Amino acid sequence: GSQILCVGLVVLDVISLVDKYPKEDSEIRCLSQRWQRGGNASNSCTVLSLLGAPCAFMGSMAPGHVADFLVADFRRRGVDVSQVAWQSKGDTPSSCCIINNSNGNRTIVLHDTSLPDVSATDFEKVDLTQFKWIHIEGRNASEQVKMLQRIDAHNTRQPPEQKIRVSVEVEKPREELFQLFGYGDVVFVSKDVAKHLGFQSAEEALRGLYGRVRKGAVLVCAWAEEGADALGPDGKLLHSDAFPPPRVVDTLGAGDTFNASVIFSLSQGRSVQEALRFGCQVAGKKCGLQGFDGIV
Amino acid sequence: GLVPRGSQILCVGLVVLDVISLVDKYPKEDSEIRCLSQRWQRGGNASNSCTVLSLLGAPCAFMGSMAPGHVADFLVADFRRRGVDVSQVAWQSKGDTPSSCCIINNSNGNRTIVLHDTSLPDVSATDFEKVDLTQFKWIHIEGRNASEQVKMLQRIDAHNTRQPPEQKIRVSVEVEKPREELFQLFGYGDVVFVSKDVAKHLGFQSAEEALRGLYGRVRKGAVLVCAWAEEGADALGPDGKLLHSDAFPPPRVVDTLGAGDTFNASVIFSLSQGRSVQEALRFGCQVAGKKCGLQGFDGIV
Ligand SMILES: C[C@]1(O)CCN(c2nc(N3C[C@@H](O)[C@@H](O)C3)cc(C(F)(F)F)c2C#N)C1
Ligand SMILES: C[C@]1(O)CCN(c2nc(N3C[C@@H](O)[C@@H](O)C3)cc(C(F)(F)F)c2C#N)C1
Secondary structure (H helix, E strand, C coil), rough: CCEEEEEEECCEEEEEEEECHHHHHHHHEECCCEEEECCCCCHHHHHHHCCCCCCCEEEEECCCCHHHHHHHHHCCCCCEECCCCCCCCCCEEEEEEEEEEECCEEEEEEEECCCCCCHHHHHHHCCHHEEEEEEEEEECCCHEEEEEEEHHHHHCCHHHCCCEEEEEEECCCCCHHHHHHHHHCEEEEEEHHHHHHCCCHHHHHHHHHHCCCCCEEEEEEEEEHHCCCCCCCCCCCECCCCCCCCCCCCCCCHHHHHHHHHHHHHCCCCCCCCHHHHHHHHHHHHHHHCCCCCCC | CCCCCCCEEECCCCCCCEEEEECCCCCCCEEEEECCCEEEEECCCCHHHHHHHHHHCCCCCEEEEEECCCCHHHHHHHHHHHCCCCCCEEECCCCCCCCCEEEEECCCCCCCEEECCCCCCCCCCHHCCCCHHHHHHEEEEEEECHHHHEEEEEEEEHHCCCCHHHCCCCCEEEEECCCCCHHHHHHHEEEECCHHHHHHHCCCCCCCCCCCCCHHCCCCCCCEECCHHHHCCECCCCCCEEEEEEECCCCCCCCCHHHHHHHHHHHEEECCCCCCHHCCCCCCHHHHHHHHHCCCCCCCC
């Protein structure tokens, strides 16, 4: 019961830092270039390790030079990679990321390689006893629902002391994913998902979507410079203002920084109000830096 | 390994990692989109010419700057896949190996480019000074850091002054970017390639106007070459006779990216084989024309 497991993607982010977003059909020179290990669940692992939490990553990878870079990076951060679902078919996903240096906007052109996703069968092979918290990045929802039902079954057969806490992230406005609201102790819904469902604020989104979550669950919604909100079974809307840096230079992975910091803070026994504030704190620090070094 | 004396064609210039993403529509800033297809390609003018020289059957070498890392590893493996000798690469302790991001909009064909940064130092005259030239029969320089490259060209002239005519290294220069720094390179080389883009920027409206207008800038006995896309290519040498070749357009134009580099490498190859300027012009148009109907460099020969 010592690790935080993050289930989701690992993508190679080929970053270009620009002073202005390029206008279509133009040729701009970038300020700098870097490779960064990406993917939501993968980014959350980086943050958890920097926060001082033992963590594990579970996701699909295909042997090759890109996976070698990603594995070395994960290992350099002390992220346990023993749960990786190695694939014989597909290439490693990669994306071209344009980071605007004047406002931190990040634009991602993802190349999804048909790498088969982590299956309920792959998850069934995992001994859950070493995990205190399991975070699932919403992707192949029907297959992830089965993984979540397995954690519930495990929890039924354990005393309250040994129960594995569960969190779910619904970040893409894909209908398949909306069934994941009914699973997990903590549900993270993105601003992009909330806006697609017709909500114009975090408070509105929480009130509107709370009926979709499991009994006793906490629904969390971060809203960029507007900070973040959370709503629990007691019906009290919780809010935290953002901690924006004086100069916002990179928001790539700011959402993942928030998620990991909220999870970390809750796994440490802190209240929802303290976890919300801490998430905004670390996410805000991240936005004033390139990458993840120096967030703590 | 052992490279026989006077056997290679050396190409000095840029190697870049081109990341090309094909999209339905141009992404709006701060959005996360999925591309239709994505490819990692080795680019750069001198780099592209090396590929073509290898496919033509010429032993060839590339000289350019690279920084140790995963990008350089991809580029080196891609050079090797194309039989290019990479032993002359100027490995750098500072800077990033060039990488570019191209976004191609599938609904209108628009190409948006986020060019490589300027962090990596270019090949210097002192890096070039360390090269034993005896293994090269031809040295092609892609015009970049002109003041440094002029010194490299002066070193080849000095080498040649002490050589019998049969052991003289032939030299070619490409002025492809409309940068004033580069215009001093016209006065160097046996063969000078000037691009249509450079010629137009200098106010020339045809390969003929460009050659007649710029010939006064080349050294005694040099051949000035100018390809003009579908209008074919022209050359002008010391005899004052303007030479022309019509283009050999493919039945359907597929990919013109690196067609200029294909022309340059084919002209060089043909001249290094002892063919005349007229024959080299025609051969350059033929290979460049074949390339335009092909994706990449496979099947150009
Ligand atoms: C958990 C998060 O919601 C993920 C995104 N995020 C932030 N996004 C910001 N922007 C994204 C894009 O809309 C830009 O125009 C500005 C700006 C900031 C801030 F300014 F506060 F630093 C934060 C913070 N933290 C926190
Ligand atoms: C050595 C070269 O001059 C460099 C470019 N080139 C061509 N460019 C063409 N363009 C089409 C358009 O996309 C523009 O880039 C110009 C069309 C053709 C042709 F139609 F003839 F095949 C050729 C040929 N050969 C040969």
